[model samples]
Target: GHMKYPVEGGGNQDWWPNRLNLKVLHQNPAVADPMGAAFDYAAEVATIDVDALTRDIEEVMTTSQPWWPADYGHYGPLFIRMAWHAAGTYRIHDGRGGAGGGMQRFAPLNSWPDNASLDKARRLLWPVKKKYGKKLSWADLIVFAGNCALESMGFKTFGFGFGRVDQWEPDEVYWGKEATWLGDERYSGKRDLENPLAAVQMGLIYVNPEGPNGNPDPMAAAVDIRETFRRMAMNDVETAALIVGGHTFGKTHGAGPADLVGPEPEAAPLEQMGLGWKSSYGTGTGKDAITSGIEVVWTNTPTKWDNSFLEILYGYEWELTKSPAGAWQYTAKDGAGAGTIPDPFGGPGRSPTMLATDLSLRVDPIYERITRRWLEHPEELADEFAKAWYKLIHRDMGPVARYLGPLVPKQTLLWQDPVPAVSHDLVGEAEIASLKSQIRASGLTVSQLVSTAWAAASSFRGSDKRGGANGGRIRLQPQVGWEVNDPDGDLRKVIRTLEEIQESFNSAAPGNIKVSFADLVVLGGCAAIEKAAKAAGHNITVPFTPGRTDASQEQTDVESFAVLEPKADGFRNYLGKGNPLPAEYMLLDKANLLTLSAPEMTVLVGGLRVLGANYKRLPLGVFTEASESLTNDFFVNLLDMGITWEPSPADDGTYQGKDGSGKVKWTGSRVDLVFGSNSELRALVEVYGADDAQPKFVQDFVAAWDKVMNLDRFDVR
Candidate 1:
């Protein structure tokens, strides 16, 4: 880490405003990275063309019917919502929180009720990710999606810069732990009272509660909004523009401050401290559950980003009322038709409405003047909003300099690649019994079974084609009403029709215990891969694809399955379980279990780690959980870490290594570990061992796995 410039002037703020300079007086530990790695990986940045990305985004918005024609049938509201939430966590005071970190990917931040229904938005972008992941990142894609939403909805041309990196945690303060509420009764959630600006900024972003509790004090809310802008180094005008400009895109859920039954009782003495361990954005139960109404879109065109909000804010007279729930809502009794032009049911109220916070602007003379100016000049507000929005997203994102260009792959007509056919012969009862016993002895891991079986079948099926690593081409097919009417546009049709073809095979292998080899193969191959995820530690939906059909004993020969057995796995050179020969010693001419070349084998072995397959779980020893993540940690441990191996006490085929922690542990198979032992294979291994090789390693592993799986069925049609 380099020395960061000291905060100059006013309160001796320790962090700098513009960290873009080469020499800042502060040495921020988080943003600090290898000077060489950042520069060395310039060309590797997945780039996407802004123009192409915009087209694809607009296509989804128009065709996806996110909301439908009855309401505002555009994803603009959701896209901007995602962008706002992603950036809303920014705390300018100490340079923490913001969209670049991608902390929301974690369940705690993502599952909060404040972020209710937003998981849909993230998943909606999954296809965009699957298609363009090679060129862009989730962080940049999110910010870009918001810009697309704005531009599509007629906000002025957006201004953006690439290079925002993704992080799994919020900040150093809450790095190892999840952010929760830190306040109790005596203290409001405002943690930084010493710095008025910082406290206000925290209030604005952190205290979005479920009901009246959040909207209790209008005066305090106004002051917080003003100070929040001040803390972010923006003027009252910029603050006013952002409030009015941002609300232009979406509607708010009907959850805010509860209205008092009589005169305002002596206000409860409390404030929400800040976002931390105790923070919650859900509406409180009992009285709080009585919301005003279902959620309401703010402006007439909720899907469009325009100045309609300010137009109504200026034209209408507003007052707080216990309109629906006993909660406070500022509504214009007359002309309450802002969100109900084509569909009356889609609105929050009969007349145009505003939240208590929205009303605060008019209440405070300081913000009122700025609000008036913004309403008077919508075009100027848009310019200011764009600039401010840029700053908001980039806040706390220390200097980033990387190549950015059109990198999203050209949208291709998607098609499911054909999968290879497997022998339909059923495994004899004896072999099946042994395999089941093996699984039971190991403590059932369905995902591991999928990996091992897929490896066995694919390696044998593609023996000749792969000198060792050149076979599977991965293809994905979507599900349900995504697309069916259009053959060229829909990839699901291919999978569905082929699956029907497999069902057609079931007629011949009928009645009794009939399972097609294709079915058996895919049940473990595709279905298994789908079930296979990185470590969840929590229950999750496992993806499954069912369509394989096995051939009869007559259609498939035992000779083929025999050839596939060990199919005498020659790659490792082990004749049997006790064979002492090294990996290079070929005992007999057996089918190479995995068709991958030595380099391909090296990459695939590492790939299993990326897929969360810690291949060394059997016969004693605890393992590091990090190996289950999509990283090069396996290679790192093998090479960089002090790894000394010794023969197993059982004199079994497997070897053992004592890692840096000094725990003796059984490791992966002799063949898999050969990548570390052999010079030719080790060369490729070290290439991925670079500090920056995780992403490429993942990509390479996927390609290699796909090649093996799709060896025989090479045609897309």
Candidate 2:
């Protein structure tokens, strides 16, 4: 009947969730936004050793066979889960805790018992100190990297703090006791010390988060300031009573000193009955073992900062347990034993069992975290009684997720007028952080996002420009959506006035209400101006194109674009008829290097060819595959060797300007670059040409395509 059994003989590595799959470790790879930048300010100030630390930390995650190494059973995923769990202990102002240094692992903090990878997590970034010019402590590196990961993935910023101590003695420390360190003044500006009690206490306080009586203030609780009021209600608890539920989502695997028999196959000596993947125990084959009493992180939203604690609070059947009867058995529902969940393994589990579980369940007055949450949810209780109730509830249910909902609608709305749309639309700036990853993945660049955004916003209100086979404009949406990116054209302003509004809101508006604008202006300013200028006169220059072109020579792309500028005659569309290869006149931006690699360049060219392939029959020509190939070669060379060269025209059709059949189409001293990396790239035209090319511009054109193949976005590099 599809019931898994206790085949725990040995060496069975594939039993648990395949660690390498990493389907759920996290929800999103948050992009570094404004808030992220603010967090990194401290790191930059510290001049911390980053690269070496990343190496050391990696060893910790990859050392154990099943847990760390790729071949063995998957234990690294558990490490990922643990890292999040340790940090998720974060509570607001309750204590001086935050995702600062993630010092919450009681089991691993004091002693490096060989179960969870935390022992590894502790050492992961040690090597990083040697590589980077800066020097940072492990405490700072781990949590900070996690923040980096989260931000790069597009999640809200995790308000960072630091309680990590350097000399935190792993030996001689007791597990059951409180944190090794303490001090809540982390955010207000205080010092970090290495103490066990402080560490434990810090973790506990993060979970509690209540400030004093009954107020839920993120500013007070240490959550990010940019978060909206609506989000506040969900992640925040009653600042006073500490009423915050949802830890059930973060259940732990089972482990203990007074161990039992019949090691469930799904975990160690427990899941004979039935349970999902659990953490720890040596890799099934290799001598090395993994950490974790349990493994969780795949299914939840990988991007959000607040879901880890929610898992265990629910007490899913997966986490192991020791019942009141003094016997270990399946915990939660529909699994082993006679519990709600039929054992994932097999027939009912027997007496005196050992199962997968979490540290929260092991503590005295078990489940204290769970009950405190319920009390915090309803009428936030008074002080003493509230703490008492919180402790009592956890003791009974265990510290895992069980139920949901704190359906409190916002009492104080921010908007002055109740418009249908709730808040100002956010126009996402295409992040350059993950450009390499995107390039490796699908051969696309960040420029496309910008182009698409511009195209979408500009054409949103158009009737004819957007007309096509799909009726209401499929191309525009394919480029960028109107729902969010409201390009300036729609706002009736050829010139941006949002900054003016921001100033107005702060200084001129009735109150000091700073209005945020929804504009992706990466290429809208000087780039636009230069484009307008060159379109009219072809004035290519370095400063004008950013990372793309050379500034001194002719601006061909700009000139081509200038043709688009309407003439008073009204009868002709200058750009449409001129066929200046306007696109060539326009180059890629310097800011988008990360997401656009050579292979990505190739893919982008191919795709654009397909999408914009409908070249019109004009006297001037459009960009061809060969033209794009040379252009792409030029940029890749700039990226690889940091050199620049002028592109040479080809005999067949590499010409930038063209006209009617051999009546001798056009004249050219040829074109010159403007501003941007594109100019630098375009300068590489000589490298891609045959031996007949000019000697001044020639050099080896590297195997650009070969190198592009090795990149993996998931890897640390």
Candidate 3:
């Protein structure tokens, strides 16, 4: 509705809620407190791209077309009015009615006759609402739209903030007791006429003041004007500028006082009457009727934003005049243009201008002084205008907001919490020496051998472990192996490259590097994963923790390593490379090897394949890829081909894969093939497969790697 005010005993209706109870409130939180409520709501909301939001506002404001009164391309004036009306409702005494509540969207107030036209502006944004959903709140959108409208005019007067939620109910007092309809009078008499102080509370001017002579009451008028601006939290300078600047567009399009003629197709029906206007003085011959339909424009370039309004106010000698419909207002007598107005409106001979409210500023001694300064030093006025504009919008947000001044530009949403560093003394010096001695005796590269084993151990560990719902289930157990079971002996060949390098490093160090083979393995694997993730457009920093104690052959029994071999032999369909694939198979206890579910096995096998490590399944080699670059390519390619099962020769859930042409049928292990059949695990597999270059998959895979690499360790935090 055009007029809403604060209720007595409502406390501070503008104060934000201290807590959210998850129950519906009769009043929306933004209405309760416009400023703090937004920040409060942000705590629980999802992250949003602020830049995208700003862009959306820009798109919606400019491209939305063909507004009222003639398909005129410019709705700038109406939008400006929408924003102005939204924030104008605040009453300082009790903090109700500010733009924070977003009450304009709901019933009674929405249908309150005065705002019938605003629904168009509001409706233009329904698509935005649908696109962004509740993620972008209506309260925020209203304030933002106003900011955009001002900014679009090339005025950077809007300060942006988000987090206001939509309200379904109008602030309770505003819809009823505090606001009683006074139909067919000023503001359609919808204003709060019952209260003696209603005019003061509603922030309006008493155009026709006390005394039966109908003379303007200067004393009461001054006090009423001061109270209105003061209650709205606006200083005199802002009051002068806002009223002047806002009229740059939007003509006085409604009716005036009863019996007054106005501009139009003639006898413009009262049925079309809106935001009912009132205020009149005695009329004379050749004078325009003082009415809303005067069709007067404030500036020549109505669609553009500039100080032309003030330029004219200072330059011309204007006298009261009337349109053909008789709406009355000031107009230039000599038919001369003012300031830098290009292509002046109302044709070559005349210029329509200013209302009585605007003329009063120059007449009032104090206000006129400020107006003169604005008229002379335009830049100073502009700077102040921007500042005042900010204050007007955030009027009820808080003192801190007021004091903090303008906000910095919005930031991009790229952030991550710091990971704690892994500390020292993880592995003993004694174990490091033993692993070095073994590496030398076996003629193996300590770095490659250790890193491969570590990466493989992660996969090996993951397969054996499981998480618990009630808690206390092991995630994985670390076991080490690398290259030995490679079908082409490729991993073994790669492992050998590390031997000479380790020897040269040891020789260079001479005494103690204080590093274990396991540490080197982690360092090597982490470096590769980090590099690959970054190249794929994912950002992450891997923190390395040292302190793994190595075991000698005596400490790590050959039998203990052999015991980790799969309990079930049929999990893998491939035998040796030279042997024909078996048509029939046997199912054994999966518990015998590190027990693994389909998902777990997929993770483990996928990790091993990417690392170029051989699975204990030998020639059944899980992956066809040869390189060691960490990738989700393993899963991506897996799903790229269609999946089918061998129903005729089914054995322990073995699956057959056909290429795109279906010319070649390939056999794969059940552990490796289950991802294609299981619904839940398959969903994640599909994501990882399709999103290899995306952060989602890389983030997920690397996260899984962290658990695998750290299994059976005290060094991981």
Candidate 4:
């Protein structure tokens, strides 16, 4: 008999590189979490002695460890860069890569050339994290350390929010499709960086500090800096303030040749633990550190926060120079400011310097005017820098309601996408029943009701936890005008009818009982789903929780919210023109953002198709004769062996299902055909397509639908 042994090495998936991997959806499962499901970070964080935590962080800033000592006897600058790079990875397009998850502690990010030796900064805070234990998280500690660093340097910050829960596993962010580190293959045109990617090059948070691809041209660097910062959701003023204020303290370390530095953290020897980028030049640290391969001190007071950064830039006419590491940089002409800045280790004072990126701010006309205005009024610059710093770290934290502790700012900024507090009494069971009946009688088709709800709620990305149906943003600008939501003005008509019903119901209902358009939109979806289920002979109650409130147009940030607009919503089978990725890949991306499992994605798509929820009422993928009834016919028809799929002559992107006689039976897109084509997805499709799986399909679909609707409900969760 053959020996029964476990097979190691490459599995079945290793052979097929192009196969759709469902493993991405199953990331960070409960087993990977050390805290387990019962660990409530919000409640645990509430018990923290915040004042004590701040003092501990401040102490770490000044106290030097012999292994990885702080520059100027202050770790403030290092921690600041660590926190900045952590949050700086955030891009507005997909809302992925932020400090919210403390992703800086993991690989790729931990070992990026831009991140360099920030690993030492995290290790410096380990004592505080160890003392606080369960009450503090790495995510919160990383950001708070930066806050304490700023304050220790005599700069008062705006505010800090502490509710970032630690992620036990690394996330699957598409940094770029490039094959090598520091590659620059993500651009489409002149100064046009790809969508959902903020950085100009791989391994960088923003742009190349030396210049565009290290060419050392200020004008060219300005273009890359502006576009990269814009994708990170910062305006010119904010961008200028961040650069000027950030460079106020600390000096870039490049005292020796770059070749002397060892491997990054991820590739370092086992004896080094997690610390990396060890150098062999002199003491290999302090003055000898080689981060960024650029040696430059921006201000005279390298340990304090002041107007010195601007004072030095406007005070000198800089000339081209090179660091000992051979990186391109600029210094005051003829050594004008020599012996003005003190060294990190005890050495003679050095001359003031600027990177190509820094010079861009002064060279660009828009940034120049902003910098000039700041130079004239230091107080405004300080105030703006404080606010911008707060937004930088906290923008990905989403709604203010998710913020914890006493330190959260009381002032509501528009960029927070502030939704108003609920003033009206919530509807009870009876009121919800009445509202549903009214919505059903409002002459809206089941497809219209379901699609509108999806358009509202599906915008919620679990990455940053923003955009959902709770704020009634669908009725506001940007969303109301989105091409996907209102292609033929059908969504607006549905909203108008729902508004009429809202007014009529609120006018007659008891004063204590009320309903909002947000609640009405979700409730309408639930009602329509129940009706669809009933038509298929399933008597089920789609659960509805009604505390959602309406958000006004004044409170909405139209520009910021515009990023949430769907370019391709696979659930509705709407793929906009000029999409960068394949339809199936975009579908998987959207499903991942919605935080759906492979099964949930499969069931929802099947159910939506049978319910006639295609975008613009397209006939493609409507496999059932009874289109509006919630049934398993989509899966059943799709898996039928009698139908043969071929690329349609009318549109190559679409496919036509033909019978044995070559007569057109039905039509579908790549998103529709993917479930049957991919082996993993086909396994799920086969289960749902079975004769015994209709009831199971309807129940699973309703559960998945409810999950998407409640994804942004941080209050109830």
Per-candidate RMSD, Å: 24.1, 24.3, 25.6, 2.6
State which candidate, 2 or 3, has the greater TM-score: 3
Top-down lDDT ranking: 4, 1, 3, 2
Query: Candidate 2, residues 533-585: lDDT per residue as tens digits?
Result: 24324342212111111111121122211211211100010122323134332
Model 1 agreement with the true structure over 373-445: per-residue lDDT tens digits? 8787877888878767765655534321221444322221111111334334444444333323333333324
Question: What do the candidate models score in CA lDDT, each in turn?
Answer: 0.47, 0.27, 0.47, 0.89
> Could you tell me the lDDT of residue 76 within candidate 3?
59
List model 3 lDDT by residue over 54-139, tens digit each.
Answer: 67766776563433221124455666767676666655433455566576765444544334346556766666667776567777
Stretches of candidate 3 above 4 Å error? 1-46, 64-72, 111-116, 174-224, 254-294, 323-327, 338-350, 399-717
Residue 142 displacement in candidate 2 (angstroms): 2.3
2 or 3: which has the higher lDDT?
3
Q: Rank the candidates by TM-score, best first.
A: 4, 1, 3, 2
TM-score of each: 0.43, 0.25, 0.42, 0.97
RMSD over all Cα atoms, model 4: 2.6
- Model 3 TM-score, 2 decimals: 0.42
